[PDB]
């Protein structure tokens, strides 16, 4: 029993972890083989990096340092070329993910990971982390058997205190650029599948009081939604979510006509897994992880 | 910015990750140098499971009923001795990933990172308190026993916990790394419940600094209250009491913020007689009592 906020464990990403240092700039660099990835902002695009040579950039994987024979940029990341490959490097590959899908953030000051913690890319392509200055690079990763995914490069921060970066081939997550200029993140709306998969999670562990005997239809579940700020519902979702239905007997569009009640309605002064709010940082896939115990 | 409930880096304490087989049982176990540590109910039956001795089942147990697993490498055990509620299982080869490490008692109120796992696989990480009433809410299923809570304090892996149990509730039960159980537990299974739980009140103060810090105050009012004061009301909503302990490790936060600790513990007051109204604080709408004033120091 139990439910928690869970990160997959980090130690096949910290292994790749390395400060990068470049005039007064250091922030965290990803080591994989013989190519340190790190944001291009560490240069502060491309007439300040052909006044550069391999020497300006001092990367530190530990106490050691790694000498850069080589620099080139894609879009905001740069890769710095080094003369030895990781030997800590895992199997690896580098995924570009949707709004709604979860990560677990490594986050790291002068290449020294301090922290990890479980996250949302939501709607807006902001991650609500936890970052100061020097995080730069720290990266999000989720593991697939013994395969680290990477999917998340931290840039910047955001007037409101959401997060904005990019995958590992430098492409930002949402509308957003690698400059101090005005940015502002657009408003937020509900992962709704993944309330859905929590809603599932609290049946399996024994929470059934918002249930009722009530079931809807999709289109009907998706006016409501559009109303509370609560992203549509796809019938792709619907099947997503039939694992946990067939486990729980309670039928996806069941558990949206309770969605509905407590949407219309409230908690009224009642919890669910301990939260007085309707979480949406679990996806159906780490609900299923957690309740049957997958290994790494 | 940001507050998230953060654990730290679990490298360090997968790399000491093992499978522990007794006949049918299989757990996990800490491998540190030569050493493995793991629950010594590993040794026990079906027909053990109310009351078992351990002193005579273990005597009966030879080097060779061990079985561990690192990785796909079996080790041989050469020695085995119980400490308390802990086995420890001497091994023929130090682990090279031994990190730097201690074993710590804590105290209620504290936190720490799991790593939980199945068949000596770490599965995941996350942040845990020791709760009042010495339970821990975590999130483990069959197999889970021999996982371990730390803390990391500069290269340092503090180990403070190893899960033995679940109680009937969902919440769970271990000891220190020495086998002493945390709170009155007994590892057998005879009726046993935990006590009633209650929040720890210095950590939504820590919690309440850390809003503060990142830019709420909505909940602040212009009140202060006596220590005294404020726990006849706290005991009330059954929070712990406030010690001046509490008061003067709240300290910093209190200087950093320029809002006096019993100031805080007016806004505290009002929160409770009051709730949120509608509002969340760091994107919660209960009070959060998972980070301790050294969590919030650490994370902001
Ligand atoms: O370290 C940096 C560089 C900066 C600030 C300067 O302006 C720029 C311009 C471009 C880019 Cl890509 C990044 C930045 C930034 O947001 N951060 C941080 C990143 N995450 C959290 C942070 C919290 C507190 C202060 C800073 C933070
Ligand atoms: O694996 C075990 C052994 C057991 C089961 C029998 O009763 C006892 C009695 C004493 C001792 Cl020390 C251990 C146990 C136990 O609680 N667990 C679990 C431990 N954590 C979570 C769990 C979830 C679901 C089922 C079991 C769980």
Redesign the pocket.
Known sequence: SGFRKMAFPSGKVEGCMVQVTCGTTT?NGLWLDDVVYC?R?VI?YEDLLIRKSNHNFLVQAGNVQLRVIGHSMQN?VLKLKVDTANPKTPKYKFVRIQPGQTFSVLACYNGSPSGVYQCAMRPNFTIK?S??????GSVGFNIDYDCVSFCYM????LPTGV??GTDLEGNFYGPFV???TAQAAGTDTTITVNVLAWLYAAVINGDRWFLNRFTTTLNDFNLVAMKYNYEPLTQDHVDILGPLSAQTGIAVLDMCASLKELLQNGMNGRTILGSALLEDEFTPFDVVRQCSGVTF
Request: hydrophobic residues 25%.
């Open positions: 922030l944001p902002h502060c905001c982390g970052f100061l200055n020097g995080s730069c931290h840039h910047m921060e997060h904005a690698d400059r101090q």
